[PDB]
Amino acid sequence: SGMRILIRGNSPVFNYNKATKRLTVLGKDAGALTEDPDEGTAGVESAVLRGFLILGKEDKRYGP
Amino acid sequence: PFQSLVPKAARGQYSGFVRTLFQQMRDVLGTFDTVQIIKLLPFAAAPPKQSRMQFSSLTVNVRG
Numbered sequence: 001s002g003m004r005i006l007i008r009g010n011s012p013v014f015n016y017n018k019a020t021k022r023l024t025v026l027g028k029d030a031g032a033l034t035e036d037p038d039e040g041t042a043g044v045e046s047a048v049l050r051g052f053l054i055l056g057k058e059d060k061r062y063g064p
Numbered sequence: 065p066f067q068s069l070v071p072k073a074a075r076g077q078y079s080g081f082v083r084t085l086f087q088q089m090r091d092v093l094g095t096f097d098t099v100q101i102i103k104l105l106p107f108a109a110a111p112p113k114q115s116r117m118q119f120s121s122l123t124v125n126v127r128g
Contacts, residue, residue, distance in 0.1 A: 063071030063123050 008048045066106040069124045078122050079110035 023030035
């Protein structure tokens, strides 16, 4: 069966729980993750698109 | 009415790009394209801004 890993989000093959900060792979447990001091805080995500930066949430001003 | 469709956050940046481009037609002769002018004219009506961005396509909002 061909399962999928979503580039942005959580998938059954890979689910990250922020609350407990734990990684679950195919139901089983993988471990816990700390936070890098360099971890970005502005919300800008760069590794979700080939040549684009996700600058934030929906902005209806820019259009549909 | 046309400017009601164009996205709010891009009416200026679009308009300037058209206006500047329209100026390029008045400077150099032989570039007076009727179809291009008619196509791009409605985007001019706005408080134009300035940006180096060279648009390829201008967005419009139609039924969301």
